[PDB]
Amino acid sequence: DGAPPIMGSSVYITVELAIAVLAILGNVLVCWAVWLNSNLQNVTNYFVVSLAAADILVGVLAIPFAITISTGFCAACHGCLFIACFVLVLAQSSIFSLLAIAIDRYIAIAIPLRYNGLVTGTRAAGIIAICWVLSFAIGLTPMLGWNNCGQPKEGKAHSQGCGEGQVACLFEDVVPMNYMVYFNFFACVLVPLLLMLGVYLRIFAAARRQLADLEDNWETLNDNLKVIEKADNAAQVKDALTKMRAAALDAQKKDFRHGFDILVGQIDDALKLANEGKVKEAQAAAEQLKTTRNAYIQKYLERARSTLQKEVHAAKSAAIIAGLFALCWLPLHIINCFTFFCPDCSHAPLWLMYLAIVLAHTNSVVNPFIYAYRIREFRQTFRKIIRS
């Protein structure tokens, strides 16, 4: 009752080739956009390009390799091992790029004053090169001896007419499942993804605190102004002014500096009048602070808030990319856990394996769409490339 295998194979192969074309076209566009637009040439987007390069190689190499290993063709076992393991290199490189992007965004939100001195393009290129070497080491670890080539399935090889030293080339026949679950999934995929989640939680928590701090200093500026107006002695004016002077410097950490120079100076003017017991003169001097607040301080408040909201928006776009990676790759890893941990369970059917593989490959298509829909500089650059 077995339908011809070439029928179901043709559907799987046709879908894979369609995904490969789309993965190449979209991510080549990403690389072409960063190359052309200097506004897109930053450390964050160098890891984006490294991530796009991995997705280009999914369509050029990993998908042709996946098509090849689905046939079970006769091959030298270590040759079969290489084409089976190469996708692990690309997946690992993607994980390193995703983790670097999250860390890069955390440095920008937590220590922006020393970000440009710490995170440079030259150091980013060196990190990218190191992560690619580690991705080959991790993904090709089975070629170092942790494989099933020492125990070939000779009955399957003889039935397919394979020569001596050859095996029917199938992923689960050469790559050990304990490597795939413990080493690749748990250690090399799950742990970095959980680290990324922790980094993004710290990014959004840091942004929420900084936006709260901005609003607290703005309220303290306006509350103590009311305290001075309804004060009854010079000591009460002095108490409210001392809190404003420290909060003004706390919020200060050309037109920006001039606005705060006026503010602290006007606070000092009113403070000197308060220390001399001149309540009415100190209150009138403190009323001049409202002119500085409307013309300078509120504009800084708004611009600083706008910058934080743009960093939140960019961190969400990056987190969506990392989340979609997890969504597309987790089914394959969960299936391997069932194969490995439940030998009394029937193996997941072949059609489900193909579907899980196609889903993982589709992740190499989605990133250019996230950039186009969420990052205006990419979207506008994409339009210029396509129109021209």
Ligand X SMILES: CCCCCCCC/C=C\CCCCCCCC(=O)OC[C@H](O)CO
Ligand Y SMILES: CCCCCCCC/C=C\CCCCCCCC(=O)O
Ligand Z SMILES: CC(C)CCC[C@@H](C)[C@H]1CC[C@H]2[C@@H]3CC=C4C[C@@H](O)CC[C@]4(C)[C@H]3CC[C@]12C
Binding residues for ligand Z, rule: CB under 6 A, are 75-76, 78-80, 82-83, 327, 330-331, 334-335, 337-338, 341-342, 345-346, 348
31 binds ligand Y (CB under 6 A): yes
Q: Which of residues 367-386 bind Cl ion (CB under 5 A)?
A: 375-376
Report the chain's C-alpha Rg in angstroms.
Answer: 30
Residue from the set 25, 111, 118, 191 that interacts with ligand X by CB under 6 A: 191
Q: What are phi and psi of 166, to 5 degrees?
A: -100, 160
- Going from the C-alpha of 170 to that of each of 8, 197, 329, the distances in angstroms are 17, 34, 19
Least distance in angstroms from the C-beta of 376 to Cl ion: 4
76 binds ligand Y (CB under 6 A): no
List Cβ neighbours of 199 (8 Å cut-off, separation of 6 or more).
99, 102, 103, 106
Least distance in angstroms from the C-beta of 252 to ligand Z: 43
Residue 29 interface partner, choices ligand Y, ligand X, ligand T4E, none, CB cut-off 5-8 Å depending on type: ligand Y
2: left (phi over 0), alpha (psi -120 to 50) or beta: beta
Residue number closest to ligand Y, CB atom: 126
* Interface pattern 119-158 for ligand Y (x via CB under 6 A): ---xx--xx-xx--xx--x---------------------
Query: In terms of CB distance, is 245 or 374 closer to Na ion?
Result: 374
Report how far apart the first and last C-alpha atoms of the chain are (Å, whole number): 55
The tokens describing 77, both together, are 């076992």
3-state DSSP assignment of residue 75: strand
Q: Which of residues 1-40 bind ligand X (CB under 6 A)?
A: 5-6, 8-9, 11-13, 15, 31, 34-35
3-state DSSP assignment of residue 166: strand
What's the CA gap between 84 and 139, in Å, rounded? 10
The tokens describing 374, both together, are 């969420």
Cβ(72)–Cβ(157) below 8 Å: no
The tokens describing 57, both together, are 């190689």
Least distance in angstroms from the C-beta of 161 to ligand Z: 14
- 179 sits in which H/E element: none
Residue 319 interface partner, choices Na ion, ligand Z, ligand Y, none, CB cut-off 5-8 Å depending on type: ligand Y
* Interface pattern 36-75 for ligand X (x via CB under 6 A): -----x----x--xx--x--xx--xx--x--xx-xxxxxx
The tokens describing 289, both together, are 């602070």
Cβ(47)–Cβ(76) below 8 Å: no
Cβ(67)–Cβ(162) below 8 Å: no
> Where do we find the tokens 């964050």?
44
What's the CA gap between 229 and 126, in Å, rounded? 59
Would you tell me which residues interact with ligand Y (CB under 6 A)?
10, 13-15, 17-19, 21-22, 25-26, 28-29, 31-32, 35, 56, 60, 64, 67-68, 71, 73, 122-123, 126-127, 129-130, 133-134, 137, 193-194, 196-198, 200-202, 205, 319-320, 322-324, 326-327, 330, 346, 348-349, 351-352, 355, 362, 365-366, 368-369, 385-386
Would you tell me which residues interact with ligand T4E (CB under 6 A)?
62, 66, 87-88, 91, 171-172, 332-333, 336, 357, 360-361
Would you tell me which residues interact with ligand X (CB under 6 A)?
5-6, 8-9, 11-13, 15, 31, 34-35, 41, 46, 49-50, 53, 56-57, 60-61, 64, 67-68, 70-75, 78, 121, 123-125, 128-130, 132-133, 136-138, 140, 143-145, 186, 190-191, 341, 343-344, 350-351, 354-355, 358
